[model samples]
Target chain A: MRSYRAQGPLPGFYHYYPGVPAVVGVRVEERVNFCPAVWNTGLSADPPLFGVSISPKRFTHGLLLKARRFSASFHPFGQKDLVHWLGSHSGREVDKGQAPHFLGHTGVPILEGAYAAYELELLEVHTFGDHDLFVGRVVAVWEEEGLLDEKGRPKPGLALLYYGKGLYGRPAEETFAP
Target chain B: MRSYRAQGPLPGFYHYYPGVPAVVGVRVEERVNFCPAVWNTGLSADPPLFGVSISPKRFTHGLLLKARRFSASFHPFGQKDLVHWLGSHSGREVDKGQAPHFLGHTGVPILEGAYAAYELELLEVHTFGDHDLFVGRVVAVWEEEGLLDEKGRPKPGLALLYYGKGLYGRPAEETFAP
Candidate 1:
């Protein structure tokens, strides 16, 4: 086992951790947007199920309730700053396309230049005090050229790291060689 | 938006962080074990549904499956080391009784010195690639005498941090207030 230690505040951001699969962005209603979350995790593989937590107060919460579907865009490490920026702001206040949005399937706005993206169908919701869990099934997956390996898995050329709270960092290495 | 920056890795082990409720333990099949998992997130409030992830490779996986019930022990920061040790080793080889395992209602092992613990009944199983997602209903709860405030919440104390990639740490500051 290998480990790296750095002294600092724990990454506050929840959900998307390093080494997990990458996802693309999707259009919700009339808005094309993507919010970075470290809360995404695999729940079940038989139905290809996964879950993501969203604060009930965030704009994505409304979109989640309205669309019952969203896309997860995965970018490589090279685009860490872009993902961080998208996660830092709210769609209710700003136009993501004005900053760094990429157009993809159905002309949905995703982070421009992401390595891959996935369109998920929302299946269920679990409520916590302050957040709601969105369970989804992976319906579609796509990737950029040369981003995958011999097994057709996206190479970990770039990965996102949720340090602790709200900070975002890129992975220094990729250990997902199965 | 309220944000604070503290430098360091997140102080908890196991990915997909959640603030779970305390549970009680019970005995089953002559084995007492303490399980610390964040996979138990709220799925519903009416019936009170939650999910926990158990790696098939872990020793407790079979025990959990055989018994169809388990206990969730919630501890403060001081218990970080013990929790990490419990999660770090494979139960197949370790003598958990040598640790801090304590007897509970169903005879399943519970963390003896935990701030609080929860007893749950398995509701459903969603098997993933490498892990099994166990969803349960919280049935019973217990805690150290006078450990919680009048509001029935835990007081500020040391909490464990789960940093991915085999790294574990402790919370530097207490987020739980009395």
Candidate 2:
């Protein structure tokens, strides 16, 4: 019940954070890259659709378009350093520091340490303002043990949460059951 | 690592939870509705585009398409009960239980107790799978005092976080500045 204020011009999308960050891995021929993304979400449940917005400027953007398949990996709070490094360094500049990964069924690189990853087949692409939204169908799903139940609902665990501006946090250990 | 497992047939999109939840408000003429959304993300930073997926069956979906404008409101952990109630009860069957709200710049209903709310103009709509993606251009932002700094980066505070299957939590007060 604090006092409210309004601003006409926007600053950035940080108001929506802190958010769960996903390290999106892509492979185009021999090239493999990983980029951390907070601007991603699941679109549908039945068809298992997921969407992520990547700027055209990023190196992985071109690879994602050409490859038409990518894996979005979610990690525990312990890997925040690795997540930050992957986001800070570009594939065009460095060799990715070679994060451990294995190929999924669709030949996409799934991060080795991820608690869960979605192997997606690119269905459609649309340009939205400065970023492009990649719509994908979940062709496969990989997970580490005890992360999710049989129903795909998450169990209690700490995952990387981004607070924008290079800061990170995790959800509390407890949950409120409604 | 507790050994990895891959499943070709996906169960649901619950792996992406628990995510920061946003209450999206829409108004079509005299009819106003609000729905809880975890399947939402910021698409573009420069132009400030935001996207949320709403199922075609939801009452808010039709109103959003007709309104051409909506408000996405984020609340603190204290409002989790209200958030859950709004999502569980259908606007068609009930009267939204009439949560307090105010009009934004775009004439969309902004939740009264939200920590932050974005007034957006509908830019594009795309069908991803069973749900439709509503992309909006953020025109105005409303914030409660002391939630954000001068640059829009979030200051420390507890916000509503959603875990699949009627669960909710809040981010830890301490943050990791990497």
Candidate 3:
């Protein structure tokens, strides 16, 4: 018999793109570099907390451990291929900056091509068996001005989401109002 | 010090909402409810998994046990008043459903005026030290047709979010586009 590790739980399947954004491939890292993560979200406003789930085994996890910080980039649908490339490989094997990018406050590389991105400081960590839940407070956030509404919120067209098993989805056309 | 029975780890704050959607709340037995949670997120795609975190000591905790299931409603900006009401009141003293019209589903009452609502089946329960992470599978989902795009995606203006300290957020104007 082969030795194996238990999985946390099954992530059920669904058509997630309908009202959501396209699948974005994001890089989370500290001063060292960046790595890919599909699990990210905006948590609060009073203190402006955000969260991302990362596997402790990844190289970027070390950076997160070292600096206690990371960054997230929001890629538009046009950047699907880029997201795919970043997410498909590991930072241990590739220099994310070598591919193409700009630098954000954390010295972490942001895919210059990404529509928007944010830099955050780690607030707490909760280990869930195989994955570590990293909660961070937003230190800086930037986006293409036009991509935001008059109120400065992200436009649906500018976000992306990813599903396991290589499925990528974007919001459906009717999701927007005229 | 107040005496309390020791339960397992309640759901950590991380299991709840991420970036996908915000404005998470809880309603129980048509009475006490809360608006304090900021961590809410989708766990699975197929069999659509949704989760919320609740501390065991909260009054709503017992109500959840009796109800077995709860309702999650996505409101637009116009519903901020409703968001505040459900978030601030404790059912132990008042009936939250009195102010916000509620619709009963599978023995649980859902706020009726929501832009969208879904019927869920409780699938798994994980208890953290002080909170319980409840995962539910989407058994049914529906939204006002016009509220979604042609593809049945939720429109930005129609989505609502909750920030800490009683701040409610609205979805950005754009949808994820390729």
Candidate 4:
């Protein structure tokens, strides 16, 4: 098979682009902010921990650090514009609450666009040069009504998967596996 | 939108499951193995660092900790069997090389099933209760021929996305966004 080779620095756009982009909701007193994140993941099962990295310069990052908690609100396929809006502008420049949201058990902002959301108690924080890693232990989980089938699987639908190049794609619903 | 509430732990599957699940390849001395991973991400861009969480009890964990290098190999859609096989059996019990592979620049295994792959240099290791995190910096990156479009985006096709609950799906090429 033909291939591409890179000996030096890799482009930030495509090398390991994220799928399942989510808006991380953080609240600072009366102000609520949301930051789109595709760099989040479930880190540990035993402790039910999740991690997302944010640029320390981000306004939501300041709130996240101050509150020590956040909600990962997974956006559906239809919310790409909202996702784009969240990532394009900083909370410092705009009021994010016009987009519609609710407060989770931990007082974190949970967006209405989410099909599923997880509330995390920020357990630890670290640096990775360009971004700061926020590691959180799951405190509560929430989902939209009829979100999953009786089998407890996400009902076949569009998933807001980041495709890079200013694009996002949803997965095909075909169950082509063993 | 109507929503459901939960006060306890979440199921280990489905909700917020990862797409584009990749098998991370590792080697130690003569022992070589691969493990399926969905909890991997690019942690930093300056140093081109990537991270993945593995259970310490995993046989691959032993090799990874000692060798301190690995290949993050992204598989295509049809290779769910191989992905499942790697994830199902412990490396200590099975000869994983029964599948086709080649060695990366760092001596880590790279599977033929992979469409894109990265060779990593281990930087640090940390623990998160059940899983240990391995941080690696990219030494080299490779992708199969015709893997990306002219704009350098992953071609619209089967992506080997792990939907959890014994499911792997590909993103729909049809843009379902506004």
Candidate 5:
């Protein structure tokens, strides 16, 4: 398709718009909460560093700042409702720890629904304009045993990608091979 | 599946081993190249900031540092071979722009295969230990007219998530709504 450039910020400038997205879990003391994010990434190779951008105002932000650690849970393609529940409801409103599905080691919680997850220890705190990026080293990783596919990897069927607003998606249904 | 936490780095510490992945395009002078990246994100929303982490040693890193701008083309689900060709071959060895399919505007090049893309102007550059993180402000965005879904949004089937080594996946089939 032919493309035309738009000057200034696009309608959904905040949205990376299309890509796989997941939930980030945060806990401080006994409090726990989760937020959906498509803006997380692995930073360095050795020591396995990962980073997530968070608003200083988010409740989970406070938990991460105090706990200096967090977990990321990657779910399958169709689990938007699970993340929606986590993303929409605030931990401060109720004890998220009371939920039957939430589980993690130490003070952090990892969703039982997670296909795979990483337990992290804080490495650094960085502020770029407005978002505070938390850099952490992966202290541990776990995957659901039964979900492993023939490839022996945890399989989260088509992923539900968040494209800003409330729209979620899965890949179109074609796999390109080299 | 049952979960068991494992300690230490798993071979490729830099690879997240999960999430949707996309191809990142960079053009230095006439040397154009494509690379697979899962470690990209939006850092700020109001200002439309996006960030990509590059190795200090990469050829494209040199290009990005000099160009002060670059473009990211989100290709459709079946173009892995196209991007794989771009990923496996180094621009240092040949001009990636030689391909008939690559196209763009002004200084940055967008892919003919791109479902949607952002042309970014360099905003800030920072390093977390060894990686150079380029924070670029989204100046313009473009999409293939036909590929856009009803919302006029670019759609890729299930995302092509990179899980280290040669593994690529889409979210397991399921879409949950609250």
Candidate 6:
């Protein structure tokens, strides 16, 4: 048996994690970069607003502000190593690569391995605490064939799930609707 | 084999899904309500900021604006039924119930069954498109015993993962660090 109550604050944001990773794609001049982030979500449906929170200390954060556009890619669980590499290294030191296709709308690189990707034009940016929330309007989308059902919902597949720290998880194939 | 590229816009926001569910708790006068949301993330670590996106049409949305404070609760995969129930039902017709608790910091009801919960004071509210983003400062936290490790990281457990459009998934038990 287990019990819960007010235990104060925890520095690690693991309790609120286990979110599907969003590999943010950004480009500035001849440079292309990617950053794996779990702090991302679809904010609105009408205008297709998506939000990704990034720290200013990172190289991708500066690139995003200057470029004013970015792509969010969702790679399969098999590419966890690629995601980890992008997250650990800074874009200032080296250029990142894998497989990418540039969107005509925003000119941002979308991962070719991603089951689904979004080209978003930067709409707004806000600073909350230590991170900057980049609100982008989804201008275009890329989806691999047969990955989604008739309802445009995801079919059973391995999704890259983050558990905070260095650990990662693969989501179960079985799903339930209640 | 599968391939991916620019496929234009998809109305369903399933591409960026499989997020951990946040059961938002709000109280107004004698009425209390809860709403299950997957569109939530921790915005910052220092000074601890959190964000939850909700449509204005929901009953809990108004309660949050009035109360100026709320709690976000996270249940295990087993409590998905309760989460779906809170999500499907509207607070206008009936009062919601489950195991709950109040905090001295915000007076919001944190779910007693939640492995982790946060009492937040609303800092800012912004409307992006169809939903309002509620930015809150973490005033207090509730956590179950033995759920986190020495580094304040989550131990292996079944978290409630959402895949949009009523579908729910279970995270894998095994974890990998690369």
**True-vs-predicted CA distance for residue A87, candidate 6, Å:** 0.3
Higher-lDDT candidate among 1 and 5? Answer: 5
RMSD (Cα, Å) for all candidates, in order, is 11.4, 2.5, 10.7, 2.2, 3.4, 2.9
List the candidates' TM-scores in order: 0.55, 0.93, 0.56, 0.93, 0.84, 0.92
Candidates, DockQ: 0.07, 0.54, 0.08, 0.53, 0.43, 0.54
Give candidate 5 misplaced runs (Cα > 4 Å).
Answer: A1-9, A14-17, A101-103, A149-153, A156-160, A169-177, B1-7, B12-20, B101-106, B150-152, B156-163, B169-177
**lDDT by residue for model 5 (B67-103), tens:** 7878876765466666667767777787777764454
Residue B48, model 3: Cα distance from true site in angstroms: 11
> Interface RMSD of every candidate?
15.6, 3.3, 13.9, 3.0, 4.1, 3.6
Task: Using TM-score, rank the candidates from best to worst.
Answer: 2, 4, 6, 5, 3, 1
Model 4 C-alpha lDDT per residue in residues B4-93, reported as the tens digit of each score: 444344554356665667588888888789998888876776767778889888888988888888988887777888898888899788
TM-score of chain A of 1: 0.75
Report the CAPRI category for model 1.
Answer: incorrect
Candidate 1 segments whose C-alpha is farther than 4 A from its true place: A1-26, A32-49, A53-178, B1-27, B145-153, B172-178
Show model 4 residue runs off by greater than 4 Å. A1-8, B1-9, B176-178
Summarize candidate 5's per-residue lDDT along A10-109 as a digit string, tens digits: 5555223554454677777657777776678878765567888887767788888888878876776557776767767776686666654565664567
- For model 6, what is the error of residue A129's alpha carbon versus the real structure, in angstroms, after optimal superposition? 0.5
**Model 2 C-alpha RMSD to native:** 2.5
Which lDDT tens digits does candidate 3 get at residues B50-136?
665565666766656665666555555566676666666766667655655454345445555555555555666655334565655
Interface RMSD (Å) of candidate 2: 3.3
Scored against the true structure, residue A107 in model 4 reaches a CA lDDT of 85
DockQ category of candidate 5: acceptable
Q: Write the per-residue lDDT of candidate 6 for residues B2-82, one digit (tens) a residue.
A: 323334434577887788889899877767788988999989888788999999999989999999999988888889988
Name the top lDDT candidate. 2
- What is the CA-based DockQ of model 4? 0.53
